[PDB]
Amino acid sequence: TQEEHLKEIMKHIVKIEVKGEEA
Amino acid sequence: QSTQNTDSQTRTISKNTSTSRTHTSEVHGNAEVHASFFDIGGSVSAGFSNS
Q: Taking Cα atoms as reference points, which of A1, A4, A23 lies closest to residue A12?
């Protein structure tokens, strides 16, 4: 599960982006 | 010869009303190139907004 934990830390290393509306 | 003097006071009371209806479409694009010490990514996005 060490590889899975490394993948989780890599995922944390980033932003889920933002929700922007240009209507 | 003749001279005329005139005074006039006017009171104008006005009403107005309105409606409006807007229909908005929208097509967004995006590309992205990410780079790290050993991690490089790229991303392509497109968006379809009605309003």
A: A4
